[PDB]
Every structure is written in structure tokens, then in C-alpha cells.
């Protein structure tokens, strides 16, 4: 009565689409310079990421001044002020969330947006395809428009210990409540991009009916989850004279300060993911998109785009039981029918797997998952973490 299917799907495809960073972000995380745009005459590269970066900010070297403070105007020499818009009046930047709801009060669909989307939608309305990137402080409910689209400027000539303006992107504790935003951050980020860290979970690879470990990973020392989320952001997908123009209050040259002009844009490809072990205090980073979670109570699955502190503890434990019990929609009880079971050898319910021997109750699974090993898998993890069909079953698929 119980036959097994040959079709090789994945129940995680829908859940894991927000961690496919190349698809859902389509630009760099650490340094984000994915789209080209005209500035006066020449062509320059600017932020194009389709998702928000929780905890990102520009650390200016040799500076007590914040990057969220306004750009240094005229008499403010050495460029030692910041990256945000000049503080002219404050009807475009900064804004309280209250004053965004007051300004766009009459509009229906703008009031339907969330706090991050509202700040961005506002910030990408000022005038070409050039728009200004924004920074939304959640703590203070403030919307900072950034004038300087650049992120890194840490070259070999003018930065090592010796007025020329140096900086890089980082995730320190002072930046944790900030949210870095390109002109393209989707208004539906909350249901399509990563924010929270996944508790009781490490990322993995679907190798025919069970989520397996990534073989090729970089181990590093991380004390807390913050240090792991910091390190991965430093490793993540990166898309990487003025003084006389700056002090004249030039609208166009200051807007393109430290911007590159010929395509080494990541498009979201890089060491974007990491698995943090709470017990060992090790952070395992890697540059292949994961295709599932392993349910391990000692792990936390994190990304460079994710927040440096927030953790969703509720693992999707029903995902396997739901997919097995949907795949019994040949009814459209068991007496007349026989059942073609799908290729899923892990479930919280043991009876649902229909394993040929005693399955493995995973001690470390919070969901109380049983895992059926005694069964011929039709796939393996080759070099570069590539899941591939085994030689024996190449011709059927």
C-alpha cells in the first residue's frame, strides 16, 4: 500500500526565499553600488539593494562626529561633519515618524506602508534614476536622508596614520537600532527580506528528504550573536580634489563624492550567511545560499542583512508533517487507495515518515524530530557545497 515517490522537491523553498540574497536583494550588503546613474554629466554607481540592512552605519575614522549628522557646508572644512542632508529647515530631512504621517496624511496607500517603507518612499521622491539613500533610526523614529551615497573610502594613499576624509561601513552597538536603505528597498520587506535571527536553527542544504550540514565553511571566534552578525557583515557581498568643490556648496560634485564610475558589482553574491554556536562560541560563515534549516537548540542562523540582536525562537516544526499530509491530496482513510509518499525522511510525527527501520530521534531537535537514515539517498554534496544528483540516478531526472 505504502509506495515511495521518485520526484525530488523541497518543502523549504517558500520559507527560504528571503535568505536567497542574490534573488531577493540583487546588490551588495557591506558596500551597495549596484545601479548606475548620471550625476551632472559622468556615470556613477549608487545603492540598489531591494532589502533593508539592520544595524549598518558608516564609521568615520578620526571623528567624534556621527555620519547621521549633516554634510559639512563651506566654512565646515576637513569634511568632518557627516553624510546626511544639510539642516536647512527640516520639512524633507530629518523627519519624525509623526511628521511623515502629518505630511502624507491625505494619501491612502502611503499611510498603509510600514515605518521603514514610509521613510524610504519619502526619501526616494527628491530630484535621471538617481535617488538619495536613507537611514531610519527605529529607537528615535527618525528618517535621515543621506547626501553622500558612498560607504567605504579606505585606500592605500590617503588614510593610514599621518583633512582627507576616511570611512568604512560596520555594525557596532551604537548603529544597532539604525536601518540602511537604498532607493529600491521593497515596501513588502517585512514578508520577503531577512530581519530576525532564527533561534533553534542553523542553515543547511536539502540532500534528498533531510536538511544536511554545509561541508565548506569558515570557522571564526564569536563571543555573542552580535560578534557573529558583525563578522559576517564584514565578509558579505561588497560592490567595491573634492575638498575645493565641497567648501563651494556644490550641489552635484558633493552628491557624487568618493563614488566609482567596468562591472564588479556582487549582485548579492558573497559570504552573506553564518551559523552561530552558543555553547562552542564559534561562528561558521559561508558563500552558498542555504536551502533549509537544521533544528539545533545550540545554533542561531544569521545574515549580514539581519538585525544584530532579535531572535525568532519559533522554528517551523509543522513544515514536514504539513507537506507529507498535503501530498495525501490523491483523495481530492486508506481502503480503496494506496499512498505514494513524498521524498521527506524527517518529521515531528514518527508514523508519518514510514521509515524502513527505527529512525533517529534527534536529541538536539526542539521540535522532537525523527530522522530516517536507512534509505538510499539519490543526491550528495559535491565541491563548492553543490547538491547534485548521484551518478546512479542521473538519467531518470
Amino acid at each position, epitope marked *: 500500500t505504502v509506495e515511495r515517490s521518485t520526484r525530488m522537491g523541497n518543502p523549504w523553498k517558500a520559507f527560504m526565499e528571503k535568505y536567497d540574497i542574490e534573488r531577493t536583494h540583487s546588490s551588495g550588503v557591506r558596500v551597495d553600488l549596484g545601479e548606475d546613474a548620471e550625476v551632472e554629466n559622468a556615470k556613477y554607481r549608487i545603492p540598489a539593494g531591494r532589502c533593508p540592512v539592520f544595524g549598518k552605519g558608516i564609521v568615520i575614522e578620526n571623528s567624534d562626529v556621527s555620519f547621521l549628522r549633516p554634510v559639512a557646508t563651506g566654512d565646515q572644512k576637513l569634511k568632518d561633519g557627516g553624510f546626511a542632508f544639510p539642516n536647512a529647515n527640516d520639512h524633507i530631512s530629518p523627519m519624525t515618524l509623526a511628521n511623515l504621517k502629518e505630511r502624507y496624511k491625505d494619501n491612502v496607500e502611503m499611510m498603509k506602508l510600514n515605518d521603514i517603507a514610509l521613510c524610504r518612499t519619502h526619501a526616494a521622491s527628491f530630484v535621471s534614476n538617481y535617488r538619495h539613500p536613507a537611514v531610519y533610526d527605529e529607537k528615535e523614529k527618525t528618517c535621515h536622508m543621506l547626501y553622500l551615497s558612498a560607504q567605504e573610502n579606505m585606500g592605500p594613499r590617503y588614510c593610514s596614520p599621518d583633512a582627507v576624509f576616511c570611512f568604512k561601513p560596520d555594525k557596532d552597538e551604537s548603529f544597532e537600532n539604525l536601518v540602511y536603505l537604498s532607493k529600491n528597498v521593497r515596501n513588502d520587506w517585512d514578508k520577503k527580506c531577512p530581519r530576525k535571527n532564527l533561534g533553534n536553527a542553523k542553515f543547511g542544504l536539502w540532500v534528498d528528504g533531510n536538511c544536511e550540514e554545509i561541508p565548506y565553511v569558515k570557522e571564526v571566534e564569536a563571543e555573542d550573536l552580535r560578534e557573529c552578525n558583525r563578522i559576517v557583515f564584514g565578509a558579505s557581498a561588497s560592490d567595491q580634489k573634492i575638498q575645493q568643490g565641497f567648501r563651494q556648496n556644490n550641489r552635484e560634485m558633493i552628491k557624487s563624492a568618493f563614488l566609482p564610475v567596468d562591472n564588479f558589482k556582487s549582485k548579492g553574491r558573497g559570504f552573506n550567511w553564518a551559523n552561530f554556536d552558543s555553547v562552542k562560541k564559534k561562528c561558521y560563515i559561508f558563500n552558498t545560499k542555504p536551502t533549509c534549516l537544521i533544528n539545533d537548540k545550540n545554533f542561531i542562523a544569521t545574515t549580514a542583512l539581519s538585525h544584530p540582536q532579535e531572535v525568532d525562537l519559533e522554528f517551523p516544526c509543522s513544515i514536514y508533517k504539513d507537506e507529507i499530509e498535503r501530498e495525501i491530496k490523491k483523495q481530492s482513510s486508506v481502503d480503496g487507495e494506496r499512498i505514494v509518499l513524498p521524498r521527506i525522511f524527517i518529521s515531528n510525527d*514518527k508514523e508519518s515518515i*514510514k521509515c524502513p527501520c*527505527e529512525p*533517529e*530521534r534527534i536529541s538536539q531537535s526542539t521540535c522532537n524530530f525523527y530522522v530516517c*537514515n*536507512c534509505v538510499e539517498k539519490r543526491a550528495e554534496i559535491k565541491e563548492n557545497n553543490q547538491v547534485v544528483i548521484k551518478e546512479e540516478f542521473r538519467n531518470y531526472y
Partner: antibody
Amino acid sequence: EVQLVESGGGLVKPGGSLKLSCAASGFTFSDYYMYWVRQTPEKRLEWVATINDGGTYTYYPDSVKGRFTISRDNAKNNLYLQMSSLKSEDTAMYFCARGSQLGRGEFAYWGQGTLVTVSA
Amino acid sequence: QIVLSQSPAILSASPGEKVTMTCRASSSVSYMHWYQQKPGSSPKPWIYATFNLASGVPARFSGSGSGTSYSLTISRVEAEDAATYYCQQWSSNPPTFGAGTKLELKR
């Protein structure tokens, strides 16, 4: 400790029938899978059948398809094996066996055994 | 049916010797379990899954391998090890065992 005790083996004519029994104790019988393993006079171990926790799914090799039928009385901790259309190739010492917390397809506990001789 | 080929069939060895016995699968396997059998009793689990020794077994015994080649390894034989040893897989269905390797001892 875990306790497996087989019984109900003997002489059977080639083509007839017999049922076996396997008493279980020192563990909650319903929480585990149960199996059947035979050994020939030539000393060749062969897996005979598998049954799951609740008796909802059984598994058997093509050497004893259709003839053999594994079953379990979880009410009073017993395992059985009906053996239709017997043959001299089925002549062996028969062993019931149990899995483990490790789920690697191992035979952790075995009974002493019960002998089925099939000659005319 | 995966065909496990145990070799040698008989292995005589004096007390003291490091002696090894082989097991060889037709198709590839994840890991191999091993069983000791003394005469007039059912086989007891000896090594679970290539390397991991079972409960109660002397640490003098050992195990190893990958894919198709696997191998039980005694470090120093004793008269109580005089028994027939069987390798078994259940990484592809149906599960299969080897023929056997009868450890004899010298005197």
C-alpha cells in the same frame, strides 16, 4: 535489562504453515520497531521482516514476499510471524530483534532464537 | 541486494597479535555495523556505524572504513575473542549481512 524470548518452532512439511511468538519485557514495547532475522545451517544471517511502532506499516524482502506476515500484540507485549507456503530454503534458527535510540539500521537486542526445520 | 564480501573466512592468530578482517560492499555504503557470535547463542552488536564501539565491548577492538572497504581491527587477541564476526549494512534497502570471519586462536 531488555528481554527477548522466542518460541513455537519445530518440524513442518514443505508447503504447509507455522506461526512464531517473541515475548518482550524490560522496555516500553510500543515505543520501538521490531524485526525478524534468520540464520541458515550454512551460517548466513538474513533479514526476514520489519514492523513499525503501531503495526501501520510492515516491510519484507522479495525472498519471503506474500508468504510471510509479521504482526504484534502491543496490548500484552508480543511479536509474531506467520509463515505460509513453507520450503526447505526457509529452514533456519529464527531471531526477533529491536532497534535503538541511534537510528542507523542496527540490531541492538536479539533473543536466544527458535528453530524451524522444514523437511518432508 | 548489496553483496557484502567478508575476507578471510578463517583467521588463526596467537594471543598478543594485532589482526584485521575485511568487509567489501558491491554498491557504496555510509557506514558498516559489526557483530560477534560465539557458538550456541545469537550474534551480539560489537561495532555500531564504522568506528563507534558498542556498550560492554573491550576497547582492544576497533573499526574503520569508507564507501565499500570496511575493517574490524583487534589490537591484542585473547582466547575470549574466539568467535565468528559478521559485518552488516542498512544504508540501502533491503539490509544485508556478510558470510562471516571465524577467528581461531593458536596454542
